[PDB]
């Protein structure tokens, strides 16, 4: 929840949690632990509930609860992390970025870090120079 969550979604977490309200401890026990997000809209399975109960006297409060959605923040992180890249670059959408386009995507912006690119190509080098942007990013966005 280190400022990565947005105000609107934090507010709707709270409004769902306030649907049961009761001074931040009542009617929000482990029986409603799934019901609150079932009413919110996405469905918790057995894995989701065990993630809720992994680190959790026995009755949750709002800090603990939104701490749980911090580790649930790990979910739905597949398409929106590359949505920005697909919008900004890759007009053709082939994923095989051209030579100049690849100079440009590693044109260092402010950080001016070094040895990381040459490290990446000494660790792995494509063949057909012709570096793939997809293969290029999944390695970090694992």
């Amino acid at each position: 929840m280190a400022d990565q969550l947005t105000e609107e979604q934090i507010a709707e977490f709270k409004e769902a949690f306030s649907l049961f309200d009761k001074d931040g401890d009542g009617t929000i026990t482990t029986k409603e632990l799934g019901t609150v997000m079932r009413s919110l809209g996405q469905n918790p399975t057995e894995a989701e509930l065990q993630d809720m109960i992994n680190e959790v006297n026995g009755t949750i409060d709002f800090p603990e609860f939104l701490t749980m959605m911090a580790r649930k923040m790990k979910d739905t992180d597949s398409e929106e992390e590359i949505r920005e890249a697909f919008r900004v670059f890759d007009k053709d959408g082939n994923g095989y970025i051209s030579a100049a386009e690849l100079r440009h995507v590693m044109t260092n912006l402010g950080e001016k870090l070094t040895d990381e690119e040459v490290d990446e190509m000494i660790r792995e080098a494509d063949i057909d120079g012709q570096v793939n942007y997809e293969e290029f990013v999944q390695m970090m966005t694992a």
């Binding site: 030579a99 057909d128 120079g129």
Partner: protein
């Protein structure tokens, strides 16, 4: 050349000498030119 190579070896040929001189400049230009490297790479990958 691979078919008729033995014949020129047995009988030296000024035409073969001219061909060797010819491909000498081809090879040296091939080595010298840098953009030609990626250009041939692109041409080959486009032809498949």
């Amino acid at each position: 050349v691979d078919y008729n190579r033995a014949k020129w070896l047995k009988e030296p040929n000024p035409e073969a000498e001219e061909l060797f001189r010819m491909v000498a400049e081809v090879f040296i230009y091939w080595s010298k030119s840098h953009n030609f490297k990626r250009e041939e790479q692109n041409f080959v990958v486009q032809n498949e």
